[PDB]
Amino acid sequence: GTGVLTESNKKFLPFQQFGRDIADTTDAVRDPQTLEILDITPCSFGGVSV
Amino acid sequence: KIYSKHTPINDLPQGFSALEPLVDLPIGINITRFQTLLALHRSYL
Numbered sequence A: 001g002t003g004v005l006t007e008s009n010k011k012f013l014p015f016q017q018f019g020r021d022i023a024d025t026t027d028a029v030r031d032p033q034t035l036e037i038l039d040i041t042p043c044s045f046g047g048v049s050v
Numbered sequence B: 001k002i003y004s005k006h007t008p009i010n011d012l013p014q015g016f017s018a019l020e021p022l023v024d025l026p027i028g029i030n031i032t033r034f035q036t037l038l039a040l041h042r043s044y045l
């Protein structure tokens, strides 16, 4: 995926890995190598009007 | 899949207590019957 990985304050349970929004799209990930939660946010984008 | 929960209570009680996922075991066998195991103590008398 393409996104920004940030620190999170979401209290994931030990079984929980992924995180999802209302769209059932990945919003957080728990890394196997280091057991920390990385919030995934899509990078900044917008429309350009001339 | 085994799910578990421990709930402090004062019939089955009211209210909600969601059972958290405890273990997923890759067994791959056919299961149609089950039985509970109890512990019994020797009397020594």
Ligand SMILES: *[C@@H]1O[C@H](CO)[C@@H](O)[C@H](O)[C@H]1NC(C)=O
Pocket (backbone or CB within 6 Å): A032, A033, A034
């Ligand atoms: C390697 O991964 C395991 C689980 O994925 C983890 O428990 C362990 O801490 C990792 N090793 C190091 C040096 O972080």
